[PDB]
């Protein structure tokens, strides 16, 4: 009476989101400067902000891309070790022959 | 195969020992993010002004 | 700029520029950005 | 006869026969002694059959788990039985120890981890040697805080970006939780906290210095402890939100109120299982965690996540409350604590293995021979159980 | 009584960081220029600094990528010689057949 | 005889033989009862050959389509037959139901989809738990508007 093996099973994982809302605005300050001037200044500050934002986006991508490189490299190492065990059994088989 | 194992470990040592390793990017990310946030508050205040 | 700031305000206690923007370990990366923030902070303080 | 088992004793034939019987060397034999009895302040024992028997148990445990004596010792520490003297252990305590060891070993096998990986995560001892990694950490944080105002912001959130930067962590929320946990743990000989850390870093530390101050040894242990907790997070595979909850409210995981969250072997296994469970919930995991963190989660919600009839869970919930479980389920904690959930899920898993509903499982429990001493089952009840 | 082989083992390598502390500030100087001027002047100077900063990061990344490519080519050559030997050996086997 | 099929009834030998006949547990048997009669406000039925016949059909459909009872119930909901009482189903309606089930079962098989995926997609019921995905939605839209 042969016993049939169970089906291979699928794996799964969760990827639950986190959440942080945004900030509140700080209190207003009445600058000594007229509007056309302050507008340009604000424009300058935002532009510098967008520049940092862009810069961060690239850093972020590099961080994650690198983590992947490390992961893949570690995975390759684990699989090789397994393949070495297999090859040794292959040699043994030949001795059996 | 043993040779490949050695090469693989070397490649890893490279990934970890080369200058632009994971640590660099986490270091940079955290540092810039801190700057960026502070910069935002200043920019906002300026915008409000 | 920090010295000019202090002179104009009659306040020599002011300080925005701190050491370490350049980290040998990280080859100075983001040292510039670090300084840009300090400058913005100085500017803000000036305006206020 | 006194047998001198000191690792350097250069002993006689009795010492030797023990080594042979045990198939171990002098160093291992010395530790073996200490494992069985930490009160033996000498390396000497009497040639007492009972003492020999005690050594033999310590060895058998190592043989069962394929551990060296050194490894068995590390494990007992991780278990939390590191200081239990086997030489005077009760029957129950020994059986309990064996169960804890089986639990961990099977799990480490499953996790493909060495005892040493576990030991690193469970150890409460930290080095004092100052490494370049810590030195870089201190500088990064030191500069990050030059201007920090304790009266305006949470030091932990301010440090979190730098701690994440130095721990190779992708998230400040985790760094926040890690620092928070460390404060609860009070690691290092100095029982260090983020605030103490900062007062020192602010007052005495000089970035780039070749000497600094001798108090750095506490600082170093603190930083290592943070690295230790970093290892745990990644090793566990826990969702950041869950991680935060464990640290914030460990009571949700069965901790006594106010207890620091533990990082010992059993805590680690527990969390690992939590993470596994969460992964099992798939896309519904978010709902479950929100409802778990809030005290709103119910059986029906889980049944959805579990792709089953909630009546199964409910019957299991009922048995969880009716049976004499240790930290028992009451309606109030059925889904508000991981240990409560596990109790319920065990009723479910048993029902599944036996292909019977949980009540049927309960009926089998009710046929217990000690229970029969108070209320004796009738033959007919056994007939129903068979059915 | 056949003597069995030992299990294959994993390799490992250290990747210990170096540490070089921060620079100290140079002596300050009282400029002839008013603050608004120096503010803009210094800003432009930092902007050029940040421009070099980004440029340098990009160079470093390229440098590391080329180092990796060199490694991979050297590794490929080593493996081919071993594989070349295997095929040669395979032919020899056929002669034995 | 009254057969107490309540999911928690801890029933007698008659309940037991039914479980054995159907190869299912108490919970599944209880759910089966509802499938054949959603108006049974109790957990009980009589030992009525007709009722037994009705339970058998419900089990039978699940065996045919390789579903558990729980899965059969979800499917009937997805099918749109969620409130049909099989116990009073007309001849045509039963044949119709089988065809709908064949259609869907074949299709899910073809699509390599689980009945649980279908059920989620066909749900008319929603959770009230407020998750971070939703909080993020609300802030994103709130500010955008």
Could A22 and F135 be called an inter-chain contact, meaning their C-beta atoms sit closer than 8 Å? no
Contacts of D165 in chain B (CB under 8 A): 26-31
Neighbouring chains of A at 3+ CB pairs under 8 Å are B, C, D, E, F
Q: D216 — contact with chain E (CB < 8 Å)?
A: no
**In angstroms, what separates the C-alpha of B20 from chain D's closest C-alpha?**
13
- From the DSSP assignment, how many helices (H) and strands (E) are in chain E? 1, 0
**In angstroms, what separates the C-alpha of D96 from chain A's closest C-alpha?**
33
Residue A59: is it exposed, middle or buried by C-beta count within 10 angstroms (0-12/13-18/19+)? buried
H or E element that contains D3 = strand D2-4
Contacts of B12 in chain E (CB under 8 A): 13
Question: In this complex, which of A55, A62, A88 lies closest to E5 when CB atoms are compared?
Answer: A88
Q: Which residues pair with D45 in a beta bridge?
A: D3
DSSP per-residue codes, D337-379: SHHHHHHHHHHHHHHHHHTS-HHHHHHHHTT-TTGGGTSPPPH
Q: Which residues pair with E22 in a beta bridge?
A: C23
Q: E21 — contact with chain C (CB < 8 Å)?
A: yes
Could A31 and C47 be called an inter-chain contact, meaning their C-beta atoms sit closer than 8 Å? yes
Q: B44 — contact with chain C (CB < 8 Å)?
A: no
Contacts of A17 in chain F (CB under 8 A): 131-133, 136
Q: What is the sign, positive or negative, of the torsion defined by CA atoms of D328, D329, D332, D333?
A: positive
Contacts of C36 in chain A (CB under 8 A): 48
Contacts of B45 in chain C (CB under 8 A): 44
Could D207 and C20 be called an inter-chain contact, meaning their C-beta atoms sit closer than 8 Å? yes
Q: E46 — contact with chain B (CB < 8 Å)?
A: no
The structure tokens listed for D11 are 């002993």
H or E element that contains F2 = strand F2-4
Tell me if residue D45 falls in helix, strand or coil. Answer: strand
Q: D239 — contact with chain A (CB < 8 Å)?
A: yes
Could B20 and E78 be called an inter-chain contact, meaning their C-beta atoms sit closer than 8 Å? no
Which residue of chain E has the CA closest to D133?
A: E17
The structure tokens listed for F112 are 């390599």
The structure tokens listed for D325 are 């479980």
Closest of D35, A26, D186, A59 to residue B32, by C-alpha: A59
Best mutation target, D133, D135, D139, to test chain C (most C CBs within 10 A)? D139
CB atoms within 10 A of CB D235: 17
**In angstroms, what separates the C-alpha of F10 from chain D's closest C-alpha?**
7
Could A31 and C40 be called an inter-chain contact, meaning their C-beta atoms sit closer than 8 Å? no
Interatomic CA distance for residues E37 and E43, integer angstroms: 10
Asked if B15 contacts A91 with a C-beta cutoff of 8 angstroms, the reply is: no
Q: Which residues pair with F46 in a beta bridge?
A: F2
Closest of A57, C33, C18 to residue E51, by C-alpha: C33
Contacts of F20 in chain D (CB under 8 A): 387
Q: What is the sign, positive or negative, of the torsion defined by CA atoms of B3, B8, B11, B12?
A: negative
Q: Report yes or no on chains F and B touching (3+ CB pairs under 8 A).
A: no
Interatomic CA distance for residues D293 and D225, integer angstroms: 27
Tell me if residue F126 falls in helix, strand or coil. Answer: coil
Could D291 and F129 be called an inter-chain contact, meaning their C-beta atoms sit closer than 8 Å? yes
Contacts of E61 in chain B (CB under 8 A): 20
In this structure, what DSSP letter does residue D87 have? G
Neighbouring chains of E at 3+ CB pairs under 8 Å are A, B, C, D
CB atoms within 10 A of CB A26: 11
Asked if B47 contacts A28 with a C-beta cutoff of 8 angstroms, the reply is: no
Question: In this complex, which of C26, C33, C41 lies closest to B27 when CB atoms are compared?
Answer: C26
Measured in angstroms, the resolution is 4.0
**In angstroms, what separates the C-alpha of B12 from chain C's closest C-alpha?**
21
Neighbouring chains of F at 3+ CB pairs under 8 Å are A, D
**In angstroms, what separates the C-alpha of D87 from chain C's closest C-alpha?**
53
Asked if D2 contacts D46 with a C-beta cutoff of 8 angstroms, the reply is: yes
Could F30 and D301 be called an inter-chain contact, meaning their C-beta atoms sit closer than 8 Å? no
At CB < 8 Å, which residues of chain D contact C?
A: 132, 136, 139-140, 142-143, 146-147, 207
Interatomic CA distance for residues D159 and D138, integer angstroms: 11
**In angstroms, what separates the C-alpha of E24 from chain D's closest C-alpha?**
10
Neighbouring chains of C at 3+ CB pairs under 8 Å are A, B, D, E
At CB < 8 Å, which residues of chain A contact D?
A: 12-14, 16-18, 63-64, 67
Contacts of B33 in chain D (CB under 8 A): 161, 172
Interatomic CA distance for residues F56 and F22, integer angstroms: 8
Tell me if residue C18 falls in helix, strand or coil. Answer: coil
- The three-state DSSP-derived secondary structure of F23-46 is CCCHHHHHHHHHHHCCCCCCCEEE
Could B24 and C37 be called an inter-chain contact, meaning their C-beta atoms sit closer than 8 Å? no
Q: F131 — contact with chain A (CB < 8 Å)?
A: yes
Question: In this complex, which of E5, E8, E61 lies closest to A81 when CB atoms are compared?
Answer: E8
Residue owning tokens 């959770």 = F127
**Ordered alpha helix ranges (H), D88-215:** 91-111, 115-122, 132-144, 155-167, 172-185, 194-203
At CB < 8 Å, which residues of chain A contact F?
A: 16-19, 21-22
The structure tokens listed for E9 are 């083992």
Taking only Cα atoms into account, the Rg of chain A, rounded to an integer number of angstroms, comes to: 30
Interatomic CA distance for residues E40 and C4, integer angstroms: 12
**In angstroms, what separates the C-alpha of E93 from chain D's closest C-alpha?**
41
Q: A75 — contact with chain B (CB < 8 Å)?
A: no
Asked if D213 contacts D175 with a C-beta cutoff of 8 angstroms, the reply is: no
Interatomic CA distance for residues A86 and A81, integer angstroms: 9
Assign residue A51 a region (left: φ > 0; alpha: ψ between -120 and 50; beta: otherwise).
alpha
| CB half-sphere exposure, B8, CA atoms < 13 A | 20
Residue owning tokens 């605030």 = D195
Could D170 and B26 be called an inter-chain contact, meaning their C-beta atoms sit closer than 8 Å? yes
Which residue of chain D has the CA closest to F14?
A: D387
Interatomic CA distance for residues F65 and F73, integer angstroms: 12
Could C22 and E31 be called an inter-chain contact, meaning their C-beta atoms sit closer than 8 Å? no
Could B31 and D165 be called an inter-chain contact, meaning their C-beta atoms sit closer than 8 Å? yes
Interatomic CA distance for residues A79 and D172, integer angstroms: 33
In this structure, what DSSP letter does residue F95 have? H
């Amino acid at each position: 009476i042969y016993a049939t093996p169970a089906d291979p099973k699928a794996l799964l994982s969760a990827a639950v989101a986190t959440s942080q809302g945004g900030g509140k605005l700080p209190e207003s300050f009445m600058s000594l400067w007229r509007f056309p001037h302050m507008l340009e200044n604000a424009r300058g500050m935002v532009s510098q902000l967008t520049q940092f934002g862009s810069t961060l986006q690239n850093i972020i991508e590099r961080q994650d891309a690198e983590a992947l490189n490390a992961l893949l490299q570690n995975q390759a190492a684990e699989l090789i070790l397994t393949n070495l065990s297999i090859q040794d059994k292959t040699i043994e088989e030949l001795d059996a022959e | 195969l043993k040779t490949q194992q050695e090469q693989t470990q070397s490649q890893l040592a490279f990934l970890q020992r080369k200058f632009s390793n994971q640590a660099l990017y986490n270091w940079l990310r955290g540092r810039l993010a801190a700057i960026y946030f502070q910069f935002y508050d200043l920019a906002v205040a300026r915008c409000l002004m | 700029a920090e010295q000019a700031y202090r002179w104009e305000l009659n306040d020599d206690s002011a300080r925005f520029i701190k050491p370490g923007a350049w980290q040998g370990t990280y080859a100075g990366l983001l040292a510039g950005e670090t300084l840009m923030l300090s400058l913005a902070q100085m500017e803000d303080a000036h305006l206020k | 006869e006194e047998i001198d088992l000191n690792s350097g004793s250069t002993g006689d034939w009795r010492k030797t026969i023990l080594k042979r019987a045990f198939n171990i060397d002098d160093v291992s034999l010395f530790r073996l002694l200490k494992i069985t009895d930490h009160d033996n302040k000498d390396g000497k024992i009497k040639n007492n059959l009972k003492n020999l028997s005690n050594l033999y148990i310590g060895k058998l445990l190592a043989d069962i788990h394929q551990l060296t004596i050194d490894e068995l010792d590390l494990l007992l520490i991780a278990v939390g039985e590191g200081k239990t003297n086997l030489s005077a252990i009760s029957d129950k305590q020994l059986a309990t120890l064996i169960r804890k060891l089986n639990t961990i070993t099977s799990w480490l096998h499953t996790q493909k981890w060495s005892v040493f990986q576990l030991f690193i995560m469970t150890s409460t001892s930290y080095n004092k040697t100052l490494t370049p990694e810590i030195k870089n950490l201190l500088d990064t944080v030191y500069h990050g805080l030059q201007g920090f105002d304790k009266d305006k912001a949470d030091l932990l959130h301010v440090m979190a970006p730098y701690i994440a930067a130095t721990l190779q962590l992708s998230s400040e929320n985790v760094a926040h939780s890690v620092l928070l946990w460390a404060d609860k743990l009070q690691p290092g000989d100095g029982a260090m906290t983020a605030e103490k850390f900062w007062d020192w870093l602010n007052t005495k530390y000089t970035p780039g210095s070749s000497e600094a101050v001798e108090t750095q040894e506490h600082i170093v242990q603190y930083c290592q402890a943070l690295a230790q907790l970093e290892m745990v997070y990644h090793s566990t595979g826990i969702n950041e939100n869950a991680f935060r909850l464990f640290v914030t409210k460990p009571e949700m995981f069965g901790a006594a109120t106010g207890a620091a969250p533990a990082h010992d072997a059993l805590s680690l296994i527990m969390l690992t299982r939590f993470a596994d469970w969460v992964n099992a919930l798939g896309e519904k995991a978010s709902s479950v965690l929100a409802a778990f963190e809030a005290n709103s989660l119910t059986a029906e919600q889980l049944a959805d996540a579990m792709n089953l009839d909630a009546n199964l869970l409910l019957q299991a919930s009922i048995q969880a409350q009716n049976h004499q479980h240790l930290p028992p389920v009451t309606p109030e904690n059925a889904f508000s604590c991981w240990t409560s959930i596990n109790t319920i899920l065990q009723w479910v898993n048993v029902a599944q293995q036996l292909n019977v509903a949980p009540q049927g499982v309960s009926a089998l429990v009710g046929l217990d021979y000690i229970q029969s001493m108070k209320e004796t089952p009738t033959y007919a009840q056994w007939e129903n159980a068979a059915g």
